[PDB]
Write an enzyme that holds these catalytic residues in place. Structure first.
Site, short mmCIF file in Angstrom:
data_model
loop_
_atom_site.label_atom_id
_atom_site.label_comp_id
_atom_site.label_asym_id
_atom_site.label_seq_id
_atom_site.Cartn_x
_atom_site.Cartn_y
_atom_site.Cartn_z
N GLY A 1 0.78 -1.23 0.00
CA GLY A 1 0.00 0.00 0.00
C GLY A 1 0.81 1.28 0.00
O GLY A 1 2.01 1.26 -0.30
N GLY A 2 0.15 2.39 0.34
CA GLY A 2 0.74 3.74 0.35
C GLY A 2 1.14 4.19 -1.04
O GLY A 2 0.31 4.64 -1.84
N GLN A 3 2.44 4.07 -1.33
CA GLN A 3 2.99 4.20 -2.67
C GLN A 3 2.31 3.22 -3.64
O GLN A 3 1.65 2.26 -3.21
CB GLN A 3 4.51 3.95 -2.63
CG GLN A 3 5.26 4.30 -3.91
CD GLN A 3 5.52 5.79 -4.05
OE1 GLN A 3 6.36 6.35 -3.33
NE2 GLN A 3 4.82 6.44 -4.97
N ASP A 4 2.49 3.47 -4.95
CA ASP A 4 1.82 2.72 -6.03
C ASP A 4 2.28 1.27 -6.21
O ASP A 4 3.45 0.94 -5.98
CB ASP A 4 1.94 3.47 -7.36
CG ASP A 4 3.32 4.09 -7.55
OD1 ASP A 4 3.66 5.01 -6.77
OD2 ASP A 4 4.05 3.67 -8.47
#
Ligand SMILES: Nc1nc2c(ncn2[C@@H]2O[C@H](COP(=O)(O)OP(=O)(O)O)[C@@H](O)[C@H]2O)c(=O)[nH]1
Ligand SMILES: [Mg+2]
Length: 175
Positions: free
Chosen positions: A66-69
């Protein structure tokens, strides 16, 4: 005693145990507690840290979700002979509980992993507002999984409590 669990699995056939979760869930701490060998970090791609613990027959593989792509799910390699899938959740981080449900579902939609046995470590039970395993189940709807063997285990990685128990379950499911 943890090493002895994975004795049952010494059947010679190589075996991956994918352990993922949001960053700061407790993944590194659990590996170091496995007391099974060294933790080796590798970066196969910019923004993709991988921690590995290879016992003899067994291989552990950890990274964040998650978070970043997710633009590169090059993870495909590791989806080789992943029999186990461990998902570590920070039972306190109620803010990101939505994201963990997203991330878990993705791992669960990954086709090559359809047969993996799923263990959830409800980690950080030692904190003030840490979810119990009954509600963590509800809020994630693991309940709806019909044909997937799965289990939730309360833990405190920093103290190593619960880890043996949850791995005793998983270990047993893959034997
Ligand atoms: N209170 C509490 N803290 C923990 C527990 N497990 C890990 N931590 C801490 O929470 C942070 C999570 O770090 P880490 O284990 O590296 O999570 P990772 O990013 O998924 O590998 C660290 O600072 C740990 O010291 C736990 O069971 N209880
Ligand atoms: Mg980590």
């Amino acid at each position: 005693t943890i090493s002895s669990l994975f004795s049952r699995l010494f059947g010679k056939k190589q075996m991956r145990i994918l352990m993922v979760g949001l960053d700061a869930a407790g993944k590194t701490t659990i590996l170091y507690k496995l007391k099974l060998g060294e933790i080796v970090t590798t970066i196969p791609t910019i923004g993709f840290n991988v921690e590995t613990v290879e016992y003899k027959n067994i291989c552990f593989t950890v990274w964040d979700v998650g978070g970043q792509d997710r633009i590169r799910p090059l993870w495909k390699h590791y989806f080789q002979n992943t029999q186990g899938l461990i998902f570590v959740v920070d039972s306190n981080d109620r803010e990101r509980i939505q994201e963990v449900a997203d991330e878990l579902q993705k791992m669960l939609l990954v086709d090559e992993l359809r047969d993996a046995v799923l263990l959830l470590f409800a980690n950080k039970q030692d904190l003030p507002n840490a979810m119990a395993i009954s509600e963590m189940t509800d809020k994630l709807g693991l309940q709806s999984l019909r044909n997937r063997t799965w289990y939730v285990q309360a833990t405190c990685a920093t103290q190593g409590t619960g880890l043996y128990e949850g791995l005793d379950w998983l270990s047993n499911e893959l034997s």
